[PDB]
Amino acid sequence: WKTAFYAVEKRPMFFEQYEGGSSAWCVKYQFGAEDGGFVGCCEHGRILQI
Amino acid sequence: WKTAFYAVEKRPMFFEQYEGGSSAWCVKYQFGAEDGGFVGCCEHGRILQI
Numbered sequence: 645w646k647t648a649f650y651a652v653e654k655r656p657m658f659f660e661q662y663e664g665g666s667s668a669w670c671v672k673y674q675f676g677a678e679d680g681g682f683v684g685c686c687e688h689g690r691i692l693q694i
Numbered sequence: 695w696k697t698a699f700y701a702v703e704k705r706p707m708f709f710e711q712y713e714g715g716s717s718a719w720c721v722k723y724q725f726g727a728e729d730g731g732f733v734g735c736c737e738h739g740r741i742l743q744i
Contacts, residue, residue, distance in 0.1 A: 668724050
């Protein structure tokens with residue numbers, strides 16, 4: 645797995661109040677994160693199935 | 695009435711500029727308050743009718 649697959653990390657989670665839409669009663673919070681992944685040469689590795 | 699009917703108050707009326715929906719050419723304002731009441735010993739008072 646040190647060469648079969650790969651994970652790219654860009655930005656961890658973030659939380660923030662969403663000003664606008666907040667009508668002094670319904671406080672609306674927003675959050676997000678960003679990252680991804682992909683495969684290397686998918687020959688190093690196999691899958692045992694029935 | 696000092697013991698027949700009770701009026702309960704929670705929050706004096708509050709105002710606030712409604713952020714969101716208010717822009718460089720308009721302003722939105724929003725107010726609210728919380729009050730209520732109930733009867734105490736309604737065996738105290740009496741009513742006169744026809």
